[PDB]
Amino acid sequence: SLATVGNNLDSRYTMASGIRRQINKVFPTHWSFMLGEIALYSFIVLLLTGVYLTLFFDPSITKVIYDGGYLPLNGVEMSRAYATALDISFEVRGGLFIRQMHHWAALLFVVSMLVHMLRIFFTGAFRRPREANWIIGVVLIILGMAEGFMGYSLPDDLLSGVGLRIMSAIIVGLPIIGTWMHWLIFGGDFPSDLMLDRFYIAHVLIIPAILLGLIAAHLALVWYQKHTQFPGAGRTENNVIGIRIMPLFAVKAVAFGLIVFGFLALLAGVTTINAIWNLGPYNPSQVSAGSQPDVYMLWTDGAARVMPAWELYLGNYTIPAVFWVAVMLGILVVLLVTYPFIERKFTGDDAHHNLLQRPRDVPVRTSLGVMALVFYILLTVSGGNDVYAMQFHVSLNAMTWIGRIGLIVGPAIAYFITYRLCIGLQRSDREVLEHGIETGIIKQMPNGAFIEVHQPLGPVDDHGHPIPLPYAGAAVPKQMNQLGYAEVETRGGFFGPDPEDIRAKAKEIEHANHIEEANTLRALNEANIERDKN
Amino acid sequence: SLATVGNNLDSRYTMASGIRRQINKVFPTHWSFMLGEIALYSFIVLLLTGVYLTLFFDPSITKVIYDGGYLPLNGVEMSRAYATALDISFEVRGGLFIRQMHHWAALLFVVSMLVHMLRIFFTGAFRRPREANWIIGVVLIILGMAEGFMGYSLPDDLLSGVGLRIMSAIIVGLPIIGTWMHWLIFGGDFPSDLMLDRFYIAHVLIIPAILLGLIAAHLALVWYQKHTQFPGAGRTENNVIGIRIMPLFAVKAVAFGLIVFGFLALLAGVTTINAIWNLGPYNPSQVSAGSQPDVYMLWTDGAARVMPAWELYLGNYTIPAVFWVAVMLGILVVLLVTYPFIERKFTGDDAHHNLLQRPRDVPVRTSLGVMALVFYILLTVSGGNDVYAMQFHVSLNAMTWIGRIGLIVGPAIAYFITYRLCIGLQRSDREVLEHGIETGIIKQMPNGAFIEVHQPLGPVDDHGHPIPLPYAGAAVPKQMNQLGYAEVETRGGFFGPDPEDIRAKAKEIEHANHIEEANTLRALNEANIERDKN
Amino acid sequence: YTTQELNAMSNEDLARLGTELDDVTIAYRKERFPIANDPAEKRAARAVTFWLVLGIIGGLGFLATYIFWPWEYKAHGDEGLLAYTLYTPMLGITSGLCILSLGFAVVLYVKKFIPEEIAVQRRHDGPSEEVDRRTIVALLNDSWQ
Amino acid sequence: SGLCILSLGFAVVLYVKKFIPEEIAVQRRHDGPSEEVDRRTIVALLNDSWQTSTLGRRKLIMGLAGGGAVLAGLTIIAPMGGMIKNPWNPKEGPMDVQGDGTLWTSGWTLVENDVKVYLGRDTAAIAESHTDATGEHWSTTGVSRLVRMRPED
């Protein structure tokens, strides 16, 4: 009775033709093409765990005497926000589990986007026509960071409160619109009554709406311009080689989705995050050692530490030393957002790119990427060099100076090494194409010469040295096991073999199948040669 | 500068044919095909005025002593929710304006959907294939009502608090699991902590998201069926006759869009709504005489008033009298949702209808609609029968009995009258086709017979007596001015007579224009005929 | 369509081809007035100008009243009680005059300047195609089997 | 929960790479600039819509329309000025122990108003629980958070 369900659905929405095309879209299979899905699944967990978390949370600053579940804090005056966050974790069955799931999901979300951005950057997937996706994604990461920031500052504990104090005092110190801006955001002096209400609404509605909208636009725009792929065998700029949506892509997407969901569900139980009961209510007069924000916010806090005391005292005015920090952070973002355009400016490449490129074939961009990664990592480490100093027994002043000097010398060394290594990887590729795979079977000729057997991947002439093949943009095998010359020729379990008849029959079919598979790729290339001729 | 922005936007989204298709969609022009826009524009105003309204509002039940803009109520102990709602009207510049805009928009929204649903119902736009739209829309109106309900319950004043008391005590008095369900929603006895928090988090997120999702799906699904239209000249069941999206439809949509926006901006200033400063903080002991919820919620309260004391005592258990109210309201909703299915069961016609039908041609459905409207109106009046009783000097007991009895005899009389009037309108429509327009020229024939001049719309046989034109499902003219026999033939301004030279040509041009229009319309008709005979 | 024969099409003929690729036919497109400098053009222009100027006045009024008008609360028997109770109504009057007038101006432009139009579009609905139905149940069946 | 969801995930993935057949699919890309036929058809339609509207000739109408639209926009966003607050306007009422609300005052400013301000040591005292005939309640009556301090302390 399923054909009658199809009949009703078709007779109304003329949907047979438009969904045949949806279920036939082919997507390239590569492990690095699943990194964006991690961000998507983490985002889904955040929305679901977040909604559950708002049924027990009161975002108020009004002071109350605590008389809840956590007896070691009974009788202390705290806000309604901290008291209800303490009630989620001590009075709701499985409330701590969900709270921890939420925070872990936030962390994974931001790191998933970072790693996905790195994949996009290195492989060159931001090139025409995919710059809109780059800009959308960059906005996504900044908003993700902002979202996480206003999320961990909701409980109104001592640790998060210092983050708000830092943020407010950063804004207030702005050259012209600095004290007027602070009064517009917080609704007055810090802290203020409306502050945790403006933060709550920006966190549960304002940002997630924008985020969901941008994500939806992101996915639709990706789905419209099929996907990029690595320049493999039979693959051109006018085709996609992979797997169709069903039955293979859809099931794989669900499996990996469950994997991420299950992993977050494990972390939510087995590890502690943001133990707010240890920290007390926010008090402007008391503080703790280190007191760092979340990992994604450490780069901003690290920027403030390594900036020297460079205040400008004009006539009856003051530019705080923090202002230059904002300038630097303003540059890093602008450099990141408008990357495809500066790429194109300095390279003079304005073509339609559908084929990816391996990082080793673009050494300047790869090296710039690793240079920028070292910059970001140094900012992150120096934002949290108090915990590094204490645990690893190094001078805190030495850490500050390492941050200051390392931001000049670290990127330079990173570029040099990365560039040289990229060219090295290029050279190793050419050796195989020119001479063949190094077998590793050293044998002695009658005269006494030790020679290593080389396996050519192309046709040879008639004097040993085989005609070297040109680079084709793809990975070339370098081991003899990569050609299946170490493949196990026993079928069976762990304790017992299979019958002979079922064994030899099975090797024959697998042999015929792999031969025909290679033949498809060969035939593809041939048609593509004639296609590109025209 | 403009040629080049399009060039590098098409070169990367291949959107020339996709955009051309959207801007060439034809939409039927009818005043009743716009009532759906009113709901959309009011919804946009709600979510926009709502976001502004959340920057100043603290949804906390924590009691405070008020000191603020409202010089009365200084020193009065109120909730945090009430104090901030009282602050956004007396301490925020133009905050009362926005608050009133919000409430007015809510009212218009619900009335923008109800009237829209009436248009859909009467004209038969819910028929095949448009039943998903009917179901989606019905869910939209119920959720809109629920959203409005939880919106005006946020300020936590005395009037709204009684609504929550009524709602909680309705839930608590449900058979079997009404006690556990009440404790699961409010998180304990009424009132509770995390009661204004669950409502605030479901009014500014859960409902909006659901509504936005349903609306977006609704509009997309409408754009897929490319509307419906009334029977008329040249228009068949496989075409749309109207105007293209640009330049005519898009501009008209914006023009009407801002008209609604501007109208809501007028009422927001000139007319008071929900004067919460006169109502006082919620107190379980204090009540007022006029405790009606809101216009869209009046029908539920009216149902509760006219239900007799019919309690069922079952030994150790009791069924409240209000249970039957719930049952009744449940039936009304179920009847409304599954209407297309019940209408096509008793008609036995599901034949993919794309042409609308005038209400006069479907007397049973029209009469059922007016029967249901009278039912709803009587429930609504009974919901505020205490303000009717005093202001119009009627016994309140008499009002209760009018509601009780009127729900049986009111619908019956409504059906009878409406049916007869529908057939009457049908009859008047046939007289014109059979005999012609009744002109007001009472001539006296030489014999002395007073005869009225009749204008045939069709060919005549021998001596007047027009060949009767068959009914065509369209509006037949009834007066001679509807054929432009009263058209003013003097071009010029109010004072300007206008030169005859330029006045002759313009009348000639308009004459040739409507001749060509009529010619093209009748050619379209002829095309349909010779197309329908193959 | 060879490019050679695309340059042989008018600005209008190209559009008429364009509208017909979407199953749309433009019947009865008529210019509002094909008269050389008739007073009726000036009359139509002077009506939409009225509602534009009035909207501008309304906008400036709203801005002026929003900034410079006593808006703080005044109690029963205070001096400025009248000027206060009129703040919200004045906001309503001015804002509702700005946006409303602009709306009237825009609708009056559509009705008086943009040409008459009848467009007729073919409609594509029902049980799809005979081929598409067969090849979707075959693809779905294939992926399950 | 980890075991349940993770195991189901593993089961599903282990099915696709053991039971679902091996597929290489090749799809043709349709992207880049559109066909010229349609290209000159979409620009001609947009040009027709602009020309026939006869708005280009009316300098005054479009000039005033721009102004009107700008004023409407500014009218819509104007109530956002309710958020604007003067940082240099002291909060209502006399100066309290938290200062005047501005950046100038610090609650120590009370010394300039002939108020005798001590140096208050924080004793970190909490509320006291009291159980009676009427349940248990937290009172802070006898308890002093801040206490005076001596120069020998």
Ligand SMILES: CC(C)=CCC/C(C)=C/CC/C(C)=C/CC/C(C)=C\CC/C(C)=C/CC/C(C)=C/CC/C(C)=C/CC/C(C)=C/CC/C(C)=C/CC1=C(C)C(=O)c2ccccc2C1=O
């Ligand atoms: C085929 C397919 C499914 C393709 C995928 C397309 C897709 C999902 C794209 C992503 C969506 C996009 C473009 C997002 C934009 C991202 C972005 C820049 C910002 C984020 C957006 C955001 C912050 C949202 C949160 C709050 C917010 C401002 C919401 C928007 C509020 C509004 C204006 C809602 C109503 C608009 C809406 C949902 C329309 C549905 C689309 C359709 C089919 C409309 C048809 C339509 C109808 C029916 C009218 O009556 C009408 C009357 C007068 C003028 C126009 C229209 C009109 O366009």
Ligand SMILES: CCCCCCCCCCCCCCCC(=O)O[C@H](COC(=O)CCCCCCC[C@@H](C)CCCCCCCCC)COP(=O)(O)O[C@H]1[C@H](O)[C@H](O)[C@@H](O)[C@@H](O)[C@@H]1O
């Ligand atoms: C609307 C939610 C949908 C739930 C999804 C379905 C998941 C199924 C599994 C449910 C887990 C069972 C949890 C039951 C919990 C329990 O044991 O309840 C105690 C005493 O229960 C009893 O003996 C009887 C319990 C009967 C209720 C079980 C309901 C499940 C079934 C029957 C309903 C079908 C669901 C339909 C699906 C619809 C899907 C909709 C999305 C109350 O003692 P109390 O002293 O108040 O202590 C308090 C803590 O218990 C409490 O958690 C709280 O956190 C503490 O604060 C504390 O007050």
Ligand SMILES: CCCCCCCCCCCCCCCC(=O)O[C@H](COC(=O)CCCCCCC[C@@H](C)CCCCCCCCC)COP(=O)(O)O[C@H]1[C@H](O)[C@H](O)[C@@H](O)[C@@H](O)[C@@H]1O
């Ligand atoms: C997108 C284009 C943006 C264009 C901007 C044009 C938008 C027009 C509407 C702007 C909102 C209304 C403007 C002025 C509104 C006004 O009159 O506010 C007074 C005025 O400020 C001053 O005097 C000093 C002058 C400050 C300039 C104000 C004009 C705002 C412009 C410059 C800023 C926007 C431009 C930035 C682009 C935005 C994009 C986002 C990045 C504050 O004195 P105050 O005494 O603190 O009054 C308090 C009560 O307001 C309050 O309720 C409280 O209750 C009272 O206690 C009292 O303190």
Ligand code: HEM
């Ligand atoms: C919110 C986090 C993000 C999500 C959920 C997300 C989601 C996705 C998904 C599902 C895809 C297609 C599958 C894939 O290639 O992996 C994709 C592709 C892409 N994303 Fe993201 N993305 C995110 C962040 C970003 C960021 C931060 C950038 C860039 C700075 C970016 C740029 C791109 C680009 C260029 C592609 C195209 C890859 C290709 O088509 O070759 N995305 N994204």
Ligand code: HEM
């Ligand atoms: C981009 C997605 C999101 C991120 C990155 C995010 C991040 C965070 C973080 C880092 C916290 C601190 C958690 C803690 O206190 O242990 C938090 C708390 C919270 N989030 Fe989210 N969140 C997101 C989405 C949402 C959404 C959509 C909602 C609500 C609809 C929400 C509601 C909350 C609430 C109520 C809290 C406070 C409860 C608590 O502190 O325990 N979040 N969020």
Ligand code: HEM
């Ligand atoms: C949230 C409120 C609603 C909005 C914003 C909305 C919006 C729209 C719009 C813009 C249209 C396009 C055609 C028109 O204007 O008439 C439409 C059509 C339609 N709506 Fe609604 N609608 C709403 C509520 C409803 C409700 C409550 C129902 C049904 C109970 C409904 C059923 C329909 C149907 C059947 C059509 C098709 C009319 C046709 O195609 O001829 N809608 N709606």
Ligand code: HEM
């Ligand atoms: C979906 C349509 C909506 C309807 C029908 C609706 C209805 C209402 C109503 C009737 C009130 C009472 C206002 C008053 O006291 O005068 C209200 C209050 C409120 N609404 Fe909504 N609302 C809607 C959407 C939203 C949205 C999307 C938000 C937030 C994003 C929002 C936020 C608020 C806030 C903060 C209040 C504050 C209570 C007050 O100040 O009176 N509303 N709503």
